[PDB]
Scaffold this active site. Structure first.
Site, PDB file in Angstrom:
ATOM      1  N   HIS A  41      38.582  44.485   7.344  1.00 31.57           N
ATOM      2  CA  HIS A  41      39.855  45.190   7.434  1.00 31.57           C
ATOM      3  C   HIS A  41      40.492  44.944   8.797  1.00 31.57           C
ATOM      4  O   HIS A  41      39.847  44.486   9.750  1.00 31.57           O
ATOM      5  CB  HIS A  41      39.682  46.697   7.165  1.00 31.57           C
ATOM      6  CG  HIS A  41      39.077  47.461   8.300  1.00 31.57           C
ATOM      7  ND1 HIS A  41      39.516  48.718   8.655  1.00 31.57           N
ATOM      8  CD2 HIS A  41      38.079  47.153   9.165  1.00 31.57           C
ATOM      9  CE1 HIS A  41      38.819  49.149   9.691  1.00 31.57           C
ATOM     10  NE2 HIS A  41      37.936  48.221  10.015  1.00 31.57           N
ATOM     11  N   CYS A  95      40.045  48.756  16.274  1.00 32.44           N
ATOM     12  CA  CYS A  95      38.748  49.141  15.747  1.00 32.44           C
ATOM     13  C   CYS A  95      37.697  48.210  16.337  1.00 32.44           C
ATOM     14  O   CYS A  95      37.968  47.025  16.544  1.00 32.44           O
ATOM     15  CB  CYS A  95      38.783  49.068  14.216  1.00 32.44           C
ATOM     16  SG  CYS A  95      37.273  49.503  13.377  1.00 32.44           S
ATOM     17  N   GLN A 113      36.102  56.620   3.573  1.00 28.30           N
ATOM     18  CA  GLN A 113      37.220  57.515   3.284  1.00 28.30           C
ATOM     19  C   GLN A 113      37.879  57.134   1.965  1.00 28.30           C
ATOM     20  O   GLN A 113      38.005  55.957   1.624  1.00 28.30           O
ATOM     21  CB  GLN A 113      38.249  57.482   4.418  1.00 28.30           C
ATOM     22  CG  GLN A 113      37.747  58.080   5.740  1.00 28.30           C
ATOM     23  CD  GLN A 113      38.875  58.370   6.725  1.00 28.30           C
ATOM     24  OE1 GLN A 113      39.515  59.422   6.657  1.00 28.30           O
ATOM     25  NE2 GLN A 113      39.130  57.434   7.638  1.00 28.30           N
ATOM     26  N   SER A 136      42.586  57.532   9.886  1.00 27.14           N
ATOM     27  CA  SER A 136      42.441  56.643  11.033  1.00 27.14           C
ATOM     28  C   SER A 136      43.723  55.882  11.343  1.00 27.14           C
ATOM     29  O   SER A 136      43.951  55.497  12.493  1.00 27.14           O
ATOM     30  CB  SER A 136      41.331  55.618  10.778  1.00 27.14           C
ATOM     31  OG  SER A 136      40.133  56.261  10.387  1.00 27.14           O
ATOM     32  N   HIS A 139      45.516  50.428   7.190  1.00 26.50           N
ATOM     33  CA  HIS A 139      44.582  49.314   7.039  1.00 26.50           C
ATOM     34  C   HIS A 139      45.171  48.221   6.160  1.00 26.50           C
ATOM     35  O   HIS A 139      45.967  48.487   5.251  1.00 26.50           O
ATOM     36  CB  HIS A 139      43.265  49.743   6.375  1.00 26.50           C
ATOM     37  CG  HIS A 139      42.579  50.893   7.023  1.00 26.50           C
ATOM     38  ND1 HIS A 139      41.397  50.758   7.724  1.00 26.50           N
ATOM     39  CD2 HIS A 139      42.874  52.213   7.027  1.00 26.50           C
ATOM     40  CE1 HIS A 139      41.013  51.946   8.153  1.00 26.50           C
ATOM     41  NE2 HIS A 139      41.892  52.844   7.746  1.00 26.50           N
TER      42      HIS A 139
END
Length: 145
Positions: A41, A95, A113, A136, A139
């Site tokens: 991702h 990330c 998630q 977060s 993505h």
């Protein structure tokens, strides 16, 4: 018609296309559950991310709308072949998985998630999502196995 796919009409051209509401993928061509999938991702964070901080920036200030525009531009470059998914993930993902070219490894349901899990298991091997939203941030997901 595989899970999540629907037919729609392009605004610009009036030509039929296909959209997946689970992955937010869209494509002109007609498309086409495993216990585990492997995904990479690219995450773009924004000011309302749960942790608005990354290896790239100690305080992430961009708005969610600005993060979405960044995601859209990366998707454009990946789909045009101007850039490779892994290259953009290595450079720009908010990330620590950027050091692994975005790779998260394999996982089953019940680990990630929910929006991320649903999109991952709705992708076919080699397929890429559209923008996928979690707490977060936003993505882009690439199913590799």
């Amino acid at each position: 018609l595989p899970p999540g796919w629907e037919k729609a009409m392009s605004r610009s051209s009036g030509r039929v296309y296909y959209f997946n509401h689970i992955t937010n993928a869209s494509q002109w061509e007609r498309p086409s559950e495993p216990a585990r999938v492997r995904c990479s991702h690219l995450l773009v964070k924004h000011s309302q991310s749960r942790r608005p901080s990354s290896w790239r920036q100690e305080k992430i200030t961009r708005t969610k709308e600005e993060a979405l525009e960044l995601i859209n531009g990366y998707i454009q470059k990946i789909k045009s072949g101007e850039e490779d998914f892994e290259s953009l993930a290595s450079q720009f993902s908010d990330c620590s998985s950027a050091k692994a070219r975005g790779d998260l490894g394999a996982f089953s349901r019940g680990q990630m998630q929910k929006p991320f899990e649903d999109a991952s298991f709705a992708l076919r091997t080699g397929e890429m999502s559209g923008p996928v939203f979690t707490d977060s941030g936003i993505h882009i997901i690439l199913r590799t196995e």
